[PDB]
Design a protein around this ligand. Sequence first.
Ligand SMILES: CCCCCNC(=O)N1CCC(C)CC1
Ligand SMILES: CCCCCNC(=O)N1CCC(C)CC1
Lengths: 193, 193
Amino acid sequence: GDDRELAILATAENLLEDRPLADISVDDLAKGAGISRPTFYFYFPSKEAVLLTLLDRVVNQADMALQTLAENPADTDRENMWRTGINVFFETFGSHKAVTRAGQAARATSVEVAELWSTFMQKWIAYTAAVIDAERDRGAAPRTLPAHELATALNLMNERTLFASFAGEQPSVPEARVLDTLVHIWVTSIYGE
Amino acid sequence: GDDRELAILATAENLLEDRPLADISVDDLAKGAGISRPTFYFYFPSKEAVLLTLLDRVVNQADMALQTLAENPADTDRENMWRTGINVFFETFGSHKAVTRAGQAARATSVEVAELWSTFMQKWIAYTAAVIDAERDRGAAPRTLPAHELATALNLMNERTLFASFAGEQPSVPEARVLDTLVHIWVTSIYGE
Ligand SMILES: CCCCCNC(=O)N1CCC(C)CC1
Ligand SMILES: CCCCCNC(=O)N1CCC(C)CC1
Protein backbone atom coordinates (compact mmCIF):
# COMPACT_ATOMS: atom_id res chain seq x y z
CA GLY A 1 0.00 0.00 0.00
CA ASP A 2 2.54 2.55 1.22
CA ASP A 3 5.05 -0.33 1.44
CA ARG A 4 5.57 0.54 -2.24
CA GLU A 5 6.65 3.99 -1.10
CA LEU A 6 9.20 2.46 1.33
CA ALA A 7 10.37 0.16 -1.53
CA ILE A 8 10.93 3.17 -3.83
CA LEU A 9 12.86 4.92 -1.06
CA ALA A 10 15.09 1.92 -0.33
CA THR A 11 15.67 1.32 -4.11
CA ALA A 12 16.75 4.96 -4.50
CA GLU A 13 19.07 4.89 -1.48
CA ASN A 14 20.63 1.58 -2.68
CA LEU A 15 20.99 2.97 -6.22
CA LEU A 16 22.50 6.28 -5.03
CA GLU A 17 25.42 4.43 -3.42
CA ASP A 18 26.63 3.63 -7.01
CA ARG A 19 25.67 6.50 -9.34
CA PRO A 20 24.34 10.08 -9.05
CA LEU A 21 20.59 10.87 -9.36
CA ALA A 22 21.30 12.08 -12.95
CA ASP A 23 22.25 8.48 -13.97
CA ILE A 24 19.24 6.89 -12.21
CA SER A 25 15.90 6.67 -14.09
CA VAL A 26 12.32 6.56 -12.76
CA ASP A 27 12.39 3.35 -14.80
CA ASP A 28 15.27 2.15 -12.53
CA LEU A 29 13.34 3.23 -9.37
CA ALA A 30 10.08 1.51 -10.48
CA LYS A 31 11.92 -1.66 -11.49
CA GLY A 32 13.69 -1.90 -8.06
CA ALA A 33 10.43 -1.31 -6.19
CA GLY A 34 8.70 -3.91 -8.41
CA ILE A 35 6.07 -1.52 -9.86
CA SER A 36 5.28 0.06 -13.21
CA ARG A 37 6.49 3.57 -14.23
CA PRO A 38 2.91 4.98 -13.91
CA THR A 39 2.37 3.39 -10.49
CA PHE A 40 5.68 5.00 -9.42
CA TYR A 41 4.18 8.37 -10.43
CA PHE A 42 1.20 7.73 -8.20
CA TYR A 43 3.56 7.90 -5.15
CA PHE A 44 6.11 10.53 -6.22
CA PRO A 45 6.07 13.27 -8.90
CA SER A 46 9.82 12.88 -9.74
CA LYS A 47 13.10 11.16 -8.93
CA GLU A 48 13.87 14.51 -7.26
CA ALA A 49 10.84 14.23 -4.95
CA VAL A 50 12.24 10.86 -3.92
CA LEU A 51 15.64 12.48 -2.97
CA LEU A 52 13.83 15.19 -1.05
CA THR A 53 11.89 12.69 1.04
CA LEU A 54 15.02 10.61 1.67
CA LEU A 55 16.82 13.72 2.87
CA ASP A 56 13.78 14.65 4.96
CA ARG A 57 13.82 11.33 6.84
CA VAL A 58 17.64 11.57 7.37
CA VAL A 59 17.43 15.16 8.70
CA ASN A 60 14.46 14.44 11.01
CA GLN A 61 16.20 11.28 12.30
CA ALA A 62 19.23 13.52 13.14
CA ASP A 63 16.91 16.10 14.72
CA MET A 64 14.86 13.64 16.79
CA ALA A 65 18.06 12.07 18.11
CA LEU A 66 19.33 15.50 19.18
CA GLN A 67 15.92 16.10 20.90
CA THR A 68 16.30 12.78 22.78
CA LEU A 69 19.81 13.84 23.74
CA ALA A 70 18.74 17.33 24.92
CA GLU A 71 15.89 15.83 27.04
CA ASN A 72 18.33 13.37 28.76
CA PRO A 73 21.68 15.15 29.56
CA ALA A 74 24.52 12.58 29.37
CA ASP A 75 26.27 12.74 32.80
CA THR A 76 29.82 13.62 31.88
CA ASP A 77 32.29 16.51 31.42
CA ARG A 78 31.74 19.43 28.96
CA GLU A 79 34.04 17.92 26.33
CA ASN A 80 32.01 14.72 26.42
CA MET A 81 28.69 16.62 26.39
CA TRP A 82 29.72 18.28 23.05
CA ARG A 83 31.18 15.11 21.62
CA THR A 84 27.95 13.19 22.29
CA GLY A 85 26.05 15.95 20.43
CA ILE A 86 28.33 16.20 17.39
CA ASN A 87 28.19 12.33 17.33
CA VAL A 88 24.45 12.44 16.57
CA PHE A 89 25.33 14.08 13.18
CA PHE A 90 28.42 11.88 12.60
CA GLU A 91 26.53 8.63 13.03
CA THR A 92 23.23 9.69 11.48
CA PHE A 93 24.57 11.24 8.27
CA GLY A 94 27.50 8.78 8.22
CA SER A 95 24.97 5.93 8.07
CA HIS A 96 23.34 7.62 5.03
CA LYS A 97 26.31 8.76 2.95
CA ALA A 98 24.70 8.32 -0.50
CA VAL A 99 21.67 10.37 0.58
CA THR A 100 23.90 12.95 2.33
CA ARG A 101 26.08 13.28 -0.79
CA ALA A 102 23.07 13.58 -3.19
CA GLY A 103 21.13 15.97 -0.94
CA GLN A 104 24.12 18.30 -0.83
CA ALA A 105 24.59 18.45 -4.58
CA ALA A 106 20.79 18.90 -4.96
CA ARG A 107 21.01 22.11 -2.87
CA ALA A 108 22.37 24.00 -5.90
CA THR A 109 19.52 22.63 -8.07
CA SER A 110 16.46 22.19 -5.88
CA VAL A 111 14.95 25.06 -3.94
CA GLU A 112 12.94 22.64 -1.72
CA VAL A 113 16.16 20.84 -0.73
CA ALA A 114 17.97 24.12 0.02
CA GLU A 115 15.05 25.25 2.20
CA LEU A 116 14.85 21.94 4.05
CA TRP A 117 18.58 22.12 4.68
CA SER A 118 18.17 25.75 5.72
CA THR A 119 15.39 25.13 8.26
CA PHE A 120 17.27 22.45 10.19
CA MET A 121 20.63 24.23 10.12
CA GLN A 122 18.85 27.24 11.67
CA LYS A 123 17.35 25.02 14.33
CA TRP A 124 20.63 23.24 15.27
CA ILE A 125 22.58 26.55 15.37
CA ALA A 126 19.80 28.01 17.57
CA TYR A 127 20.15 25.01 19.83
CA THR A 128 24.00 25.34 19.83
CA ALA A 129 23.70 29.01 20.75
CA ALA A 130 21.21 28.23 23.57
CA VAL A 131 23.62 25.71 25.10
CA ILE A 132 26.57 28.14 24.86
CA ASP A 133 24.52 30.94 26.50
CA ALA A 134 23.58 28.52 29.25
CA GLU A 135 27.30 27.71 29.64
CA ARG A 136 28.07 31.44 29.96
CA ASP A 137 25.21 32.03 32.48
CA ARG A 138 26.52 28.99 34.53
CA GLY A 139 29.96 30.78 34.55
CA ALA A 140 31.66 27.91 32.67
CA ALA A 141 32.31 29.74 29.32
CA PRO A 142 33.69 33.29 28.74
CA ARG A 143 31.57 35.91 26.91
CA THR A 144 33.77 36.15 23.80
CA LEU A 145 31.99 36.11 20.45
CA PRO A 146 28.25 36.55 19.98
CA ALA A 147 26.98 33.06 20.76
CA HIS A 148 24.83 32.81 17.59
CA GLU A 149 27.73 33.90 15.35
CA LEU A 150 30.06 31.33 16.93
CA ALA A 151 27.36 28.64 16.72
CA THR A 152 26.81 29.46 13.01
CA ALA A 153 30.49 29.11 12.11
CA LEU A 154 30.98 25.89 14.19
CA ASN A 155 27.92 24.26 12.60
CA LEU A 156 29.11 25.28 9.09
CA MET A 157 32.52 23.81 9.97
CA ASN A 158 30.73 20.55 10.83
CA GLU A 159 28.62 20.43 7.63
CA ARG A 160 31.63 20.96 5.37
CA THR A 161 34.00 18.81 7.38
CA LEU A 162 31.65 15.83 8.03
CA PHE A 163 30.62 15.75 4.34
CA ALA A 164 34.13 16.08 2.87
CA SER A 165 35.30 13.02 4.83
CA PHE A 166 32.08 11.10 4.17
CA ALA A 167 32.78 11.54 0.43
CA GLY A 168 36.55 10.83 0.78
CA GLU A 169 37.24 14.31 -0.70
CA GLN A 170 40.82 15.50 -1.21
CA PRO A 171 41.43 17.17 1.11
CA SER A 172 39.60 15.92 4.20
CA VAL A 173 40.04 14.72 7.75
CA PRO A 174 39.96 10.89 7.71
CA GLU A 175 36.54 9.73 9.01
CA ALA A 176 38.14 7.87 11.94
CA ARG A 177 39.78 11.22 13.06
CA VAL A 178 37.00 13.75 12.29
CA LEU A 179 35.02 13.49 15.54
CA ASP A 180 38.06 14.30 17.72
CA THR A 181 39.10 17.07 15.34
CA LEU A 182 35.72 18.83 15.55
CA VAL A 183 35.28 18.38 19.33
CA HIS A 184 38.71 20.00 19.93
CA ILE A 185 37.82 23.08 17.82
CA TRP A 186 34.30 23.34 19.46
CA VAL A 187 35.50 22.99 23.09
CA THR A 188 38.47 25.24 22.59
CA SER A 189 36.47 28.03 20.82
CA ILE A 190 33.59 27.81 23.28
CA TYR A 191 35.71 27.68 26.50
CA GLY A 192 38.79 29.65 25.38
CA GLU A 193 39.79 33.25 26.23
CA GLY B 1 44.22 40.09 -29.94
CA ASP B 2 43.97 38.49 -26.50
CA ASP B 3 42.13 41.64 -25.36
CA ARG B 4 39.12 39.75 -26.75
CA GLU B 5 39.87 37.04 -24.19
CA LEU B 6 39.90 39.65 -21.36
CA ALA B 7 36.62 41.07 -22.78
CA ILE B 8 34.98 37.62 -22.68
CA LEU B 9 36.18 37.16 -19.10
CA ALA B 10 34.88 40.54 -17.93
CA THR B 11 31.53 40.00 -19.78
CA ALA B 12 31.12 36.64 -18.02
CA GLU B 13 31.99 38.02 -14.57
CA ASN B 14 29.59 40.98 -15.10
CA LEU B 15 26.86 38.62 -16.36
CA LEU B 16 27.35 36.13 -13.49
CA GLU B 17 26.48 38.82 -10.92
CA ASP B 18 22.85 38.63 -12.25
CA ARG B 19 22.11 35.05 -13.38
CA PRO B 20 23.72 31.59 -13.11
CA LEU B 21 25.93 30.17 -15.91
CA ALA B 22 22.92 28.01 -16.99
CA ASP B 23 20.99 31.20 -17.97
CA ILE B 24 23.97 32.78 -19.80
CA SER B 25 24.56 31.87 -23.48
CA VAL B 26 27.80 31.83 -25.52
CA ASP B 27 25.68 34.20 -27.62
CA ASP B 28 25.45 36.50 -24.52
CA LEU B 29 29.23 36.18 -23.90
CA ALA B 30 30.15 36.93 -27.56
CA LYS B 31 27.73 39.87 -27.72
CA GLY B 32 29.22 41.46 -24.52
CA ALA B 33 32.78 40.99 -25.80
CA GLY B 34 31.74 42.45 -29.19
CA ILE B 35 32.64 39.34 -31.25
CA SER B 36 30.81 36.68 -33.23
CA ARG B 37 29.82 33.26 -31.76
CA PRO B 38 32.51 31.48 -33.88
CA THR B 39 35.22 33.97 -32.90
CA PHE B 40 34.24 33.32 -29.25
CA TYR B 41 34.92 29.61 -29.90
CA PHE B 42 38.39 30.45 -31.14
CA TYR B 43 39.28 31.62 -27.57
CA PHE B 44 37.29 29.22 -25.38
CA PRO B 45 35.69 25.81 -26.04
CA SER B 46 32.65 26.48 -23.75
CA LYS B 47 30.96 28.87 -21.33
CA GLU B 48 32.28 26.38 -18.75
CA ALA B 49 35.90 26.89 -19.88
CA VAL B 50 35.29 30.60 -19.29
CA LEU B 51 34.16 29.91 -15.64
CA LEU B 52 37.18 27.70 -15.10
CA THR B 53 39.60 30.40 -16.21
CA LEU B 54 37.82 33.04 -14.12
CA LEU B 55 38.10 30.79 -11.09
CA ASP B 56 41.75 30.10 -11.96
CA ARG B 57 42.65 33.81 -11.93
CA VAL B 58 40.71 34.34 -8.62
CA VAL B 59 42.42 31.37 -6.92
CA ASN B 60 45.93 32.32 -8.13
CA GLN B 61 45.35 35.95 -7.08
CA ALA B 62 44.46 34.59 -3.58
CA ASP B 63 47.52 32.32 -3.65
CA MET B 64 49.99 34.96 -4.86
CA ALA B 65 48.77 37.34 -2.16
CA LEU B 66 49.34 34.67 0.50
CA GLN B 67 52.88 34.12 -0.97
CA THR B 68 53.57 37.88 -0.68
CA LEU B 69 52.28 37.74 2.88
CA ALA B 70 54.40 34.68 3.82
CA GLU B 71 57.56 36.31 2.34
CA ASN B 72 56.99 39.54 4.40
CA PRO B 73 55.79 38.65 7.97
CA ALA B 74 53.47 41.43 9.24
CA ASP B 75 55.05 42.64 12.54
CA THR B 76 52.28 42.08 15.03
CA ASP B 77 50.84 39.61 17.59
CA ARG B 78 49.75 36.02 16.72
CA GLU B 79 46.06 36.96 16.54
CA ASN B 80 46.89 39.66 14.02
CA MET B 81 49.23 37.36 12.05
CA TRP B 82 46.29 34.92 11.50
CA ARG B 83 43.78 37.66 10.83
CA THR B 84 46.01 39.16 8.12
CA GLY B 85 46.19 35.69 6.49
CA ILE B 86 42.48 34.85 6.63
CA ASN B 87 41.92 38.44 5.26
CA VAL B 88 43.68 37.51 2.00
CA PHE B 89 40.78 35.03 1.30
CA PHE B 90 38.08 37.39 2.66
CA GLU B 91 39.08 40.27 0.42
CA THR B 92 40.11 38.27 -2.64
CA PHE B 93 37.05 36.02 -2.91
CA GLY B 94 34.80 38.76 -1.47
CA SER B 95 35.81 40.99 -4.40
CA HIS B 96 34.76 38.19 -6.81
CA LYS B 97 31.49 36.93 -5.32
CA ALA B 98 29.78 36.00 -8.62
CA VAL B 99 32.81 33.95 -9.70
CA THR B 100 33.17 32.43 -6.20
CA ARG B 101 29.47 31.48 -6.16
CA ALA B 102 29.54 29.97 -9.71
CA GLY B 103 32.85 28.14 -9.19
CA GLN B 104 31.45 26.47 -6.10
CA ALA B 105 28.29 25.21 -7.78
CA ALA B 106 30.43 24.08 -10.76
CA ARG B 107 32.40 21.77 -8.41
CA ALA B 108 29.52 19.25 -8.46
CA THR B 109 29.41 19.40 -12.29
CA SER B 110 32.93 20.03 -13.56
CA VAL B 111 35.81 17.72 -12.73
CA GLU B 112 38.38 20.38 -13.80
CA VAL B 113 36.86 22.87 -11.35
CA ALA B 114 36.82 20.33 -8.50
CA GLU B 115 40.49 19.51 -9.17
CA LEU B 116 41.52 23.16 -9.34
CA TRP B 117 39.71 23.77 -6.07
CA SER B 118 41.33 20.64 -4.66
CA THR B 119 44.91 21.59 -5.57
CA PHE B 120 44.81 25.00 -3.90
CA MET B 121 42.94 23.84 -0.79
CA GLN B 122 45.70 21.23 -0.34
CA LYS B 123 48.33 23.92 -0.71
CA TRP B 124 46.74 26.39 1.77
CA ILE B 125 46.11 23.63 4.36
CA ALA B 126 49.77 22.53 3.92
CA TYR B 127 50.82 26.10 4.50
CA THR B 128 48.47 26.40 7.56
CA ALA B 129 49.94 23.20 9.00
CA ALA B 130 53.52 24.43 8.41
CA VAL B 131 52.81 27.66 10.32
CA ILE B 132 51.17 25.76 13.22
CA ASP B 133 54.14 23.34 13.45
CA ALA B 134 56.45 26.33 13.49
CA GLU B 135 54.32 27.80 16.31
CA ARG B 136 54.67 24.53 18.25
CA ASP B 137 58.47 24.33 17.65
CA ARG B 138 58.76 28.02 18.84
CA GLY B 139 56.91 26.89 22.05
CA ALA B 140 53.97 29.25 21.41
CA ALA B 141 51.28 26.58 20.62
CA PRO B 142 50.52 23.28 22.48
CA ARG B 143 50.85 19.92 20.65
CA THR B 144 47.14 19.06 20.69
CA LEU B 145 45.66 17.76 17.44
CA PRO B 146 47.69 16.61 14.45
CA ALA B 147 48.53 19.93 12.80
CA HIS B 148 47.40 18.82 9.31
CA GLU B 149 44.04 17.55 10.63
CA LEU B 150 43.41 20.82 12.48
CA ALA B 151 44.51 22.84 9.45
CA THR B 152 42.13 20.82 7.21
CA ALA B 153 39.10 21.44 9.43
CA LEU B 154 39.89 25.18 9.94
CA ASN B 155 40.32 25.73 6.19
CA LEU B 156 37.05 23.85 5.47
CA MET B 157 35.37 26.03 8.11
CA ASN B 158 36.64 29.08 6.19
CA GLU B 159 35.47 27.85 2.74
CA ARG B 160 31.94 27.10 3.97
CA THR B 161 31.68 30.13 6.23
CA LEU B 162 33.17 32.76 3.84
CA PHE B 163 30.97 31.50 0.97
CA ALA B 164 27.70 31.28 2.95
CA SER B 165 28.02 34.94 3.97
CA PHE B 166 29.20 36.03 0.52
CA ALA B 167 25.96 34.54 -0.88
CA GLY B 168 23.78 35.90 1.98
CA GLU B 169 22.76 32.28 2.78
CA GLN B 170 20.33 31.56 5.63
CA PRO B 171 21.99 30.83 7.92
CA SER B 172 25.31 32.70 7.83
CA VAL B 173 27.57 35.01 9.77
CA PRO B 174 26.99 38.57 8.47
CA GLU B 175 29.93 39.53 6.21
CA ALA B 176 30.90 42.45 8.48
CA ARG B 177 31.26 39.92 11.42
CA VAL B 178 32.79 36.88 9.66
CA LEU B 179 36.48 37.84 9.87
CA ASP B 180 36.39 38.25 13.68
CA THR B 181 34.35 35.07 14.03
CA LEU B 182 36.89 32.96 12.10
CA VAL B 183 39.99 34.50 13.73
CA HIS B 184 38.57 33.71 17.22
CA ILE B 185 37.99 30.03 16.33
CA TRP B 186 41.47 29.75 14.62
CA VAL B 187 43.45 31.42 17.46
CA THR B 188 41.57 29.61 20.17
CA SER B 189 41.89 26.14 18.53
CA ILE B 190 45.54 26.67 17.62
CA TYR B 191 46.68 28.14 21.00
CA GLY B 192 44.21 26.42 23.37
CA GLU B 193 44.80 23.47 25.75
C1 LIG C 1 25.48 17.58 9.26
C2 LIG C 1 26.02 18.74 10.05
C3 LIG C 1 24.94 19.75 10.36
C4 LIG C 1 25.19 20.61 11.55
C5 LIG C 1 26.08 19.93 12.57
N1 LIG C 1 25.87 20.41 13.92
C6 LIG C 1 26.52 19.90 14.91
O1 LIG C 1 27.51 19.23 14.65
N2 LIG C 1 26.06 20.12 16.20
C7 LIG C 1 24.79 20.80 16.49
C8 LIG C 1 24.71 21.27 17.92
C9 LIG C 1 24.74 20.10 18.88
C10 LIG C 1 24.72 20.52 20.34
C11 LIG C 1 25.92 19.22 18.50
C12 LIG C 1 26.81 19.80 17.42
C1 LIG D 1 38.23 30.54 0.35
C2 LIG D 1 38.68 29.79 1.57
C3 LIG D 1 39.74 28.78 1.23
C4 LIG D 1 40.64 28.38 2.36
C5 LIG D 1 40.76 29.49 3.39
N1 LIG D 1 42.01 29.43 4.14
C6 LIG D 1 42.29 30.32 5.03
O1 LIG D 1 41.36 31.02 5.43
N2 LIG D 1 43.59 30.45 5.47
C7 LIG D 1 44.71 29.71 4.86
C8 LIG D 1 45.93 29.71 5.75
C9 LIG D 1 46.46 31.11 5.93
C10 LIG D 1 47.67 31.18 6.87
C11 LIG D 1 45.31 32.00 6.35
C12 LIG D 1 44.01 31.26 6.61
